[PDB]
Design a protein around this nucleic acid. Structure first.
Ligand SMILES: [Mg+2]
Ligand SMILES: [Mg+2]
Ligand SMILES: [Mg+2]
Ligand SMILES: [Mg+2]
Ligand SMILES: [Mg+2]
Ligand SMILES: [Mg+2]
Ligand SMILES: [Mg+2]
Ligand SMILES: [Mg+2]
Ligand SMILES: [Mg+2]
Ligand SMILES: [Mg+2]
Ligand SMILES: [Mg+2]
Ligand SMILES: [Mg+2]
Ligand SMILES: [Mg+2]
Ligand SMILES: [Mg+2]
Ligand SMILES: [Mg+2]
Ligand SMILES: [Mg+2]
Ligand SMILES: [Mg+2]
Ligand SMILES: [Mg+2]
Ligand SMILES: [Mg+2]
Ligand SMILES: [Mg+2]
Ligand SMILES: [Mg+2]
Ligand SMILES: [Mg+2]
Ligand SMILES: [Mg+2]
Ligand SMILES: [Mg+2]
Ligand SMILES: [Mg+2]
Ligand SMILES: [Mg+2]
Ligand SMILES: [Mg+2]
Ligand SMILES: [Mg+2]
Ligand SMILES: [Mg+2]
Ligand SMILES: [Mg+2]
Ligand SMILES: [Mg+2]
Ligand SMILES: [Mg+2]
Ligand SMILES: [Mg+2]
Ligand SMILES: [Mg+2]
Ligand SMILES: [Mg+2]
Ligand SMILES: [Mg+2]
Ligand SMILES: [Mg+2]
Ligand SMILES: [Mg+2]
Ligand SMILES: [Mg+2]
Ligand SMILES: [Mg+2]
Ligand SMILES: [Mg+2]
Ligand SMILES: [Mg+2]
Ligand SMILES: [Mg+2]
Ligand SMILES: [Mg+2]
Ligand SMILES: [Mg+2]
Ligand SMILES: [Mg+2]
Ligand SMILES: [Mg+2]
Ligand SMILES: [Mg+2]
Ligand SMILES: [Mg+2]
Ligand SMILES: [Mg+2]
Ligand SMILES: [Mg+2]
Ligand SMILES: [Mg+2]
Ligand SMILES: [Mg+2]
Ligand SMILES: [Mg+2]
Ligand SMILES: [Mg+2]
Ligand SMILES: [Mg+2]
Ligand SMILES: [Mg+2]
Ligand SMILES: [Mg+2]
Ligand SMILES: [Mg+2]
Ligand SMILES: [Mg+2]
Ligand SMILES: [Mg+2]
Ligand SMILES: [Mg+2]
Ligand SMILES: [Mg+2]
Ligand SMILES: [Mg+2]
Ligand SMILES: [Mg+2]
Ligand SMILES: [Mg+2]
Ligand SMILES: [Mg+2]
Ligand SMILES: [Mg+2]
Ligand SMILES: [Mg+2]
Ligand SMILES: [Mg+2]
Ligand SMILES: [Mg+2]
Ligand SMILES: [Mg+2]
Ligand SMILES: [Mg+2]
Ligand SMILES: [Mg+2]
Ligand SMILES: [Mg+2]
Ligand SMILES: [Mg+2]
Ligand SMILES: [Mg+2]
Ligand SMILES: [Mg+2]
Ligand SMILES: [Mg+2]
Ligand SMILES: [Mg+2]
Ligand SMILES: [Mg+2]
Ligand SMILES: [Mg+2]
Ligand SMILES: [Mg+2]
Ligand SMILES: [Mg+2]
Ligand SMILES: [Mg+2]
Ligand SMILES: [Mg+2]
Ligand SMILES: [Mg+2]
Ligand SMILES: [Mg+2]
Ligand SMILES: [Mg+2]
Ligand SMILES: [Mg+2]
Ligand SMILES: [Mg+2]
Ligand SMILES: [Mg+2]
Ligand SMILES: [Mg+2]
Ligand SMILES: [Mg+2]
Ligand SMILES: [Mg+2]
Ligand SMILES: [Mg+2]
Ligand SMILES: [Mg+2]
Ligand SMILES: [Mg+2]
Ligand SMILES: [Mg+2]
Ligand SMILES: [Mg+2]
Ligand SMILES: [Mg+2]
Ligand SMILES: [Mg+2]
Ligand SMILES: [Mg+2]
Ligand SMILES: [Mg+2]
Ligand SMILES: [Mg+2]
Ligand SMILES: [Mg+2]
Ligand SMILES: [Mg+2]
Ligand SMILES: [Mg+2]
Ligand SMILES: [Mg+2]
Ligand SMILES: [Mg+2]
Ligand SMILES: [Mg+2]
Ligand SMILES: [Mg+2]
Ligand SMILES: [Mg+2]
Ligand SMILES: [Mg+2]
Ligand SMILES: [Mg+2]
Ligand SMILES: [Mg+2]
Ligand SMILES: [Mg+2]
Ligand SMILES: [Mg+2]
Ligand SMILES: [Mg+2]
Ligand SMILES: [Mg+2]
Ligand SMILES: [Mg+2]
Ligand SMILES: [Mg+2]
Ligand SMILES: [Mg+2]
Ligand SMILES: [Mg+2]
Ligand SMILES: [Mg+2]
Ligand SMILES: [Mg+2]
Ligand SMILES: [Mg+2]
Ligand SMILES: [Mg+2]
Ligand SMILES: [Mg+2]
Ligand SMILES: [Mg+2]
Ligand SMILES: [Mg+2]
Ligand SMILES: [Mg+2]
Ligand SMILES: [Mg+2]
Ligand SMILES: [Mg+2]
Ligand SMILES: [Mg+2]
Ligand SMILES: [Mg+2]
Ligand SMILES: [Mg+2]
Ligand SMILES: [Mg+2]
Ligand SMILES: [Mg+2]
Ligand SMILES: [Mg+2]
Ligand SMILES: [Mg+2]
Ligand SMILES: [Mg+2]
Ligand SMILES: [Mg+2]
Ligand SMILES: [Mg+2]
Ligand SMILES: [Mg+2]
Ligand SMILES: [Mg+2]
Ligand SMILES: [Mg+2]
Ligand SMILES: [Mg+2]
Ligand SMILES: [Mg+2]
Ligand SMILES: [Mg+2]
Ligand SMILES: [Mg+2]
Ligand SMILES: [Mg+2]
Ligand SMILES: [Mg+2]
Ligand SMILES: [Mg+2]
Ligand SMILES: [Mg+2]
Ligand SMILES: [Mg+2]
Ligand SMILES: [Mg+2]
Ligand SMILES: [Mg+2]
Ligand SMILES: [Mg+2]
Ligand SMILES: [Mg+2]
Ligand SMILES: [Mg+2]
Ligand SMILES: [Mg+2]
Ligand SMILES: [Mg+2]
Ligand SMILES: [Mg+2]
Ligand SMILES: [Mg+2]
Ligand SMILES: [Mg+2]
Ligand SMILES: [Mg+2]
Ligand SMILES: [Mg+2]
Lengths: 63, 100
RNA sequence: CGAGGGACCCGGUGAAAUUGAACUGGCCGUGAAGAUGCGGCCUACCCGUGGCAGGACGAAAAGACCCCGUGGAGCUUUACU
RNA sequence: AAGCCUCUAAGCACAACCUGCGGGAACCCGUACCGCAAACCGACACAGGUGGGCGGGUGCAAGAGCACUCAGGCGCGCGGG
RNA sequence: GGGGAUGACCCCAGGCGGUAGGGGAGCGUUCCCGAUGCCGAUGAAGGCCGACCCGCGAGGGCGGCUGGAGGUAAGGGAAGUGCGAAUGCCGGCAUGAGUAACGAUAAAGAGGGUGAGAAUCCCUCUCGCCGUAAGCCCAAGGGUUCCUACGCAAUGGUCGUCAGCGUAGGGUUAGGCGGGACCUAAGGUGAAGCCGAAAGGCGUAGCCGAAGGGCAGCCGGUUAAUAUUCCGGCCCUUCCCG
RNA sequence: GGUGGAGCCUGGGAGUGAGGGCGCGAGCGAUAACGUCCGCGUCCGAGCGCGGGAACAACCGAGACCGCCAGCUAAGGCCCC
RNA sequence: GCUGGGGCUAGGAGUGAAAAGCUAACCGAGCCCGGAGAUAGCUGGUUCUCCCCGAAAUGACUUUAGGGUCAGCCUCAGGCG
RNA sequence: AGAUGGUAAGGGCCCACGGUGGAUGCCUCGGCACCCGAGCCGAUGAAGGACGUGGCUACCUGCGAUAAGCCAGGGGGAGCCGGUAGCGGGCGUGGAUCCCUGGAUGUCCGAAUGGGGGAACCCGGCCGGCGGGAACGCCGGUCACCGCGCUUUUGCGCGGGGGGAACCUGGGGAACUGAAACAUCUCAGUACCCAGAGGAGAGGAAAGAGAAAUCGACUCCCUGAGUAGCGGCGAGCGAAAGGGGACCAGCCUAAACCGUCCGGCUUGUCCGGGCGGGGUCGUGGGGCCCUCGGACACCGAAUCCCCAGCCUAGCCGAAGCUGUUGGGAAGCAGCGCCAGAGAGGGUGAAAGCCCCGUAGGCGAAAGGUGGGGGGAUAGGUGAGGGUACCCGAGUACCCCGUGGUUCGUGGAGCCAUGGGGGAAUCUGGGCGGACCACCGCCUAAGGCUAAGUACUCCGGGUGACCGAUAGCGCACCAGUACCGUGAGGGAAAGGUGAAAAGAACCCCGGGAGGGGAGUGAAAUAGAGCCUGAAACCGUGGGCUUACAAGCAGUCACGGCCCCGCAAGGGGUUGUGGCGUGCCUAUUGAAGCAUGAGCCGGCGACUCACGGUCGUGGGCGAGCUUAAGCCGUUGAGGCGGAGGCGUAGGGAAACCGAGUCCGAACAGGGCGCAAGCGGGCCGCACGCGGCCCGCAAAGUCCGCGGCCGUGGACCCGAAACCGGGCG
């Protein structure tokens, strides 16, 4: 039957108009104590390289 | 359970045999194999001495049938013979007002 | 050493697993490292009958020992539920 | 437990039961053959297994053991060198 | 890259080993549009050949023999579409090979007869084996295998005229023998009753349930095949009637 | 300089992730292994197509589009097979 | 003690003078059907032809080393030149 | 001293002819899938069988001691006594055989049902009959259980038991697999077990839905939408509202009040129950009393009656001859004919005009259906005020433990409840997702309901469906032979010829088997007989082998033989030279690693729904249909519910060519406009934007690669669970 949208992907990443995949940076949620204002602050929606051709495949029917 | 296009009795004419056309009297009709045995094809069929109905050594007996799709019934005064019609108060066979 | 039932010959019926095709020699070397088939030398007319089983890594069973599989079961306990 | 022997309840004692004398009726299934093998069970005319009874005589002390033989069967369903 | 008659035809330069792979171009089979058509007894599909023709090919034409009634362009499409391997499957035929075996080492020999054909079938004379059986009588079990007549298509571990093999015709006779119309044990079913989602499971009385109890038959003859049943003698039992 | 099945970007599509030999630079080993694991390159794998090394994948030459009863050469040889 | 006849006990169960034996010729949990065309990163097989290019056995990670995701190597198409 | 020819017990290669062998080619009496019509049977004895019946009968089929059958009616009109032969018999225009409907009989078993029973057997009771009939036997009725109404107990009538290919509902209910282990989850409430009913079932007239003061029973399809949501937030599972459609039907009953009878009895003035009037509601309805009154007019079945029509048998139904090859004309040649019929099949071969039927039109005595259409009846019909008597009791509601909806305990609603507590009757309650107030919707704790939807034992028509290793397991005398105690497993086996015209007769031979002769177009078309391949086994001819060593071959020279007028070609190897079978798995195979005895046949990368990319088209800021409706039954249109994109950011609010991070126009991430075909010279070189490439710009369809869910390239487990057989 019709394929199902991966709800983990739909809740974690956000695909833009021109094919790019926008997701947050890691190493921030659990422990944030011994980090500078740079390491706390620079969580700025990193981009994913050569994996979005295997990441927009499960953001498929509604994109 | 196909019926026939000829009766018992009524004079019939062959069309597509080894011989092409001679007048005969249909005996008998036999609609199981759908084949008339009218008067035409005598056969040389073998027969064992055992019985004996012919007490020397004979080699010919009763007949051989012809397929009923070849033959056609004549109306008795016409020369017309090909067609069939029915249904005038009794199921007869009348074409080109020739009788049955 | 002797006797009987087989083995051997003849008359009759007459299978079986195996089987790539084979016109299938020995030695010394090479080749996946144990050669009838590759190279060199030597021997050998063709085809059989009875026997031995040394070879064809002969046959049987997709190792029965060992290892792997996030294989499956039997059993144990203060391993979990 | 039943047949049979005996005593009684309801009932019946013109009935009912017992012994004789004469006359009738007695129904449904099995019934052959093999049954310790060629016919049963073993894919087979298979050296295997299959319950009960009669299962002789003579001699070995006795005996269903052993040896032979009555009645009964059999030469084993491939033979000849 | 060029002559660019755009030539989808010829020149120039370079290249053309290849697995797993990536890509391009074709052949063959079933069916369908073309097909209310065309080819086909002067011979269709299929089978056996060709040293013939074309194509780098899967192949396609043409010629000959057999065959007896179907096949189908060109241009396209849909695939149950191409086999040598899977200790693949199914059917046939080989090797093993005229080889092992032919089934308890109880044992055969001979003369006649039938018959086309006899070590094997029938009769006769010897020899051997079992004889607490390799003999006889029943219950299991098997289901006509029993007998006669006619035969060897197939079977009998050989042959076979024989057969427990085939065809046809007969053959099993019961008040007293073994079972039911008698009874009961283990066990099963099961009025009442009890329990469980349903199917159902226990279960008194009663019923079924046997090589258990009771019940009236012994001897001999008869057929090729039936016998305590048919027959001869003889004795009994159950029930009913007067 | 270098027009080459050279490169660069995007998209589609696989396969591979057991390697091995040889020379050098090394480790472990024993300065042993056709032993194990790296790097620099080649070859086999995928060139078991060819010639030589007798035979042999990696030692040498050479990179097989097809055909010819034509020559010249690479490695290796010129006594005969 | 042996045995005939009629029965009862059964699959995570029965039975067992206890071997994990036997339960219809194979029992560390039978047989038949269905789920079920279960799963298998584990073997084997995978069928017409021609042409062009052409690999890898490497790196980074995984209750993982015989399998994987990405990168490296290859091919096709479209652009840069 | 020498040497070539030569011998073939036998072999090898090639050629020709045979046998075994049954593939290929061609046909169907066959089943497969779709479409509709239709869809329960049965104590008045089902589905299915055992046994028996034919003058002779092995089997299949039809029947049941009335036994390949009997009676009545309709069709049918001349051949019959089934497949099915053979001997022997009789029937039919005075309407035989055959088909359909209604009847009768219908042994025995089987729900089995008098009882027992190991199914196809045995034994009975009561009432009548028969045999001489008391004892013995037979025949014809009745005798099982359960739930109801009457019958005060007795008994009499009405139903149920069992089966049915698939479907449906309710009660139980798994495991392997997926998460690359795996216990919550998925598989899945699926397979499977039980119960009842049906031609469907279930559900159904709101204590609904959910935001609009909106819709208005229920079922099914497409959308919404793989959206919201749930989930070790992993695997994965997955709506609902609304809309476009198919269909459209709504009702009955308890309660309050009233009449009769019965029960307890204080026979009082009330209680308990069955009947008759009275009520089916959210706009609140309804009981009693008063007023408006008039219905005596209308609606109307889902009930009943009749009928159109359909089914179980059928019928009519146009149009051709001659000559030739041949055994056969339908081919071919000439002249024609019909068409509301030129679909198909058979006809010795290839036919519109030879036959059966297709086009079209008629056909019911009798029995089913009659959802379609006309009639009848039951049943419904109204407004204001007063009274607050009634509106579905261990029930709503609360707590704990549960299932379903996407809801897995999370903030956890709603629908049913296993247990505990526990009321009210419109100023009473439930819902709008913990909960409170407001505002909206509806009346639960009783029941029924057609139509639209699923499936095919069976009937027929169709098929880019098949053609005996295919197709269902069986085209054939198949769920048979055979295996297994049993549950169960499970085959192979089609073809002579136009017509058996099936080979009379002679001879050999015991027979079988043939050789002749004859029929036959053909007899290698001979009776399991069309075509008849290969492996395999032989016979006859050419070449070569008894001094040569090889995965058996290739090249060269020569000899021998055979074709061709010749040139040349074909079969063989005596010698020389060169040479490690195929595939897999591998760093690596001729491998003493695996598979293969040979031949013929079967077989392995598709398909549904979707995503991405490329390609051929259509249209373009638009593209585009699904479900369904209307048409001949091989013809298309209608049908904008819906989907993608045109504007995107942000978690959302919200904003927008900008958004967010942030106090901010710092700064950054997302998009944005950047110009392709470009006569655009409108005459201002800012050129605004134009003939204009179907494109930046996207959609629909086709064709390919790949992917996900489905078994997904095929084969193969050790095992697990459910139901049963032993
Ligand atoms: Mg969307
Ligand atoms: Mg003629
Ligand atoms: Mg012996
Ligand atoms: Mg011999
Ligand atoms: Mg060696
Ligand atoms: Mg060699
Ligand atoms: Mg050698
Ligand atoms: Mg030996
Ligand atoms: Mg007593
Ligand atoms: Mg006897
Ligand atoms: Mg006797
Ligand atoms: Mg005995
Ligand atoms: Mg036996
Ligand atoms: Mg014997
Ligand atoms: Mg024996
Ligand atoms: Mg004994
Ligand atoms: Mg003495
Ligand atoms: Mg003595
Ligand atoms: Mg003794
Ligand atoms: Mg004697
Ligand atoms: Mg003897
Ligand atoms: Mg003998
Ligand atoms: Mg013997
Ligand atoms: Mg040139
Ligand atoms: Mg050049
Ligand atoms: Mg190439
Ligand atoms: Mg390749
Ligand atoms: Mg076909
Ligand atoms: Mg013609
Ligand atoms: Mg010819
Ligand atoms: Mg064909
Ligand atoms: Mg012929
Ligand atoms: Mg195929
Ligand atoms: Mg083969
Ligand atoms: Mg083999
Ligand atoms: Mg075989
Ligand atoms: Mg010999
Ligand atoms: Mg020998
Ligand atoms: Mg030997
Ligand atoms: Mg011997
Ligand atoms: Mg002997
Ligand atoms: Mg003698
Ligand atoms: Mg003699
Ligand atoms: Mg004599
Ligand atoms: Mg003798
Ligand atoms: Mg018996
Ligand atoms: Mg028997
Ligand atoms: Mg017999
Ligand atoms: Mg005799
Ligand atoms: Mg014989
Ligand atoms: Mg014999
Ligand atoms: Mg004789
Ligand atoms: Mg006999
Ligand atoms: Mg006999
Ligand atoms: Mg009794
Ligand atoms: Mg009696
Ligand atoms: Mg009793
Ligand atoms: Mg008693
Ligand atoms: Mg008892
Ligand atoms: Mg009992
Ligand atoms: Mg019981
Ligand atoms: Mg007894
Ligand atoms: Mg007794
Ligand atoms: Mg007597
Ligand atoms: Mg390159
Ligand atoms: Mg690895
Ligand atoms: Mg590695
Ligand atoms: Mg390495
Ligand atoms: Mg190494
Ligand atoms: Mg080394
Ligand atoms: Mg290379
Ligand atoms: Mg080699
Ligand atoms: Mg060399
Ligand atoms: Mg090499
Ligand atoms: Mg080259
Ligand atoms: Mg030179
Ligand atoms: Mg015993
Ligand atoms: Mg089980
Ligand atoms: Mg246990
Ligand atoms: Mg126990
Ligand atoms: Mg056992
Ligand atoms: Mg086991
Ligand atoms: Mg399986
Ligand atoms: Mg499953
Ligand atoms: Mg994997
Ligand atoms: Mg290349
Ligand atoms: Mg990669
Ligand atoms: Mg390019
Ligand atoms: Mg000779
Ligand atoms: Mg021939
Ligand atoms: Mg032949
Ligand atoms: Mg044959
Ligand atoms: Mg009744
Ligand atoms: Mg019946
Ligand atoms: Mg019958
Ligand atoms: Mg009449
Ligand atoms: Mg009439
Ligand atoms: Mg007849
Ligand atoms: Mg006759
Ligand atoms: Mg007759
Ligand atoms: Mg007459
Ligand atoms: Mg009549
Ligand atoms: Mg009659
Ligand atoms: Mg009738
Ligand atoms: Mg009767
Ligand atoms: Mg009964
Ligand atoms: Mg019973
Ligand atoms: Mg009486
Ligand atoms: Mg009387
Ligand atoms: Mg009387
Ligand atoms: Mg009834
Ligand atoms: Mg269902
Ligand atoms: Mg349920
Ligand atoms: Mg599980
Ligand atoms: Mg798993
Ligand atoms: Mg679920
Ligand atoms: Mg029922
Ligand atoms: Mg039922
Ligand atoms: Mg319906
Ligand atoms: Mg319905
Ligand atoms: Mg209903
Ligand atoms: Mg209902
Ligand atoms: Mg209501
Ligand atoms: Mg809706
Ligand atoms: Mg609507
Ligand atoms: Mg009432
Ligand atoms: Mg009323
Ligand atoms: Mg009526
Ligand atoms: Mg007609
Ligand atoms: Mg006509
Ligand atoms: Mg003519
Ligand atoms: Mg025709
Ligand atoms: Mg004509
Ligand atoms: Mg019609
Ligand atoms: Mg009716
Ligand atoms: Mg209607
Ligand atoms: Mg009130
Ligand atoms: Mg919950
Ligand atoms: Mg609730
Ligand atoms: Mg409760
Ligand atoms: Mg509530
Ligand atoms: Mg609420
Ligand atoms: Mg209601
Ligand atoms: Mg059908
Ligand atoms: Mg078949
Ligand atoms: Mg065939
Ligand atoms: Mg049996
Ligand atoms: Mg002639
Ligand atoms: Mg002949
Ligand atoms: Mg002849
Ligand atoms: Mg033949
Ligand atoms: Mg034959
Ligand atoms: Mg034919
Ligand atoms: Mg033939
Ligand atoms: Mg010869
Ligand atoms: Mg010499
Ligand atoms: Mg020589
Ligand atoms: Mg050579
Ligand atoms: Mg292959
Ligand atoms: Mg490899
Ligand atoms: Mg090998
Ligand atoms: Mg070898
Ligand atoms: Mg291996
Ligand atoms: Mg082998
Ligand atoms: Mg910005
Ligand atoms: Mg920026
Ligand atoms: Mg733009
Ligand atoms: Mg696609």
């Amino acid at each position: 039957p019709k394929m199902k949208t991966h709800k983990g992907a739909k809740k974690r990443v956000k695909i833009t108009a021109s094919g790019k995949v926008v997701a947050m940076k890691t190493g921030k949620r659990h422990l944030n104590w011994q980090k500078s204002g740079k390491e706390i602050r620079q969580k700025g929606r990193k981009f994913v390289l050569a994996k979005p051709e295997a990441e927009r495949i499960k953001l498929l029917l509604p994109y | 359970r196909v019926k026939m296009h000829v009766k018992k009795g009524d004079t019939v004419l062959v069309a597509s045999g080894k011989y092409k056309g001679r007048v005969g009297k249909v005996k008998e009709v036999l609609p199981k194999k759908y084949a008339v045995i009218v008067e035409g094809v005598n056969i040389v069929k073998k027969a064992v001495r055992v019985s004996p109905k012919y007490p020397q050594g004979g080699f010919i007996e009763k007949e051989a049938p012809l397929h009923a799709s070849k033959v056609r019934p004549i109306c008795p005064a016409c020369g017309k013979p090909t067609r069939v019609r029915k249904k005038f108060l009794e199921n007869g066979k009348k074409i080109r007002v020739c009788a049955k």
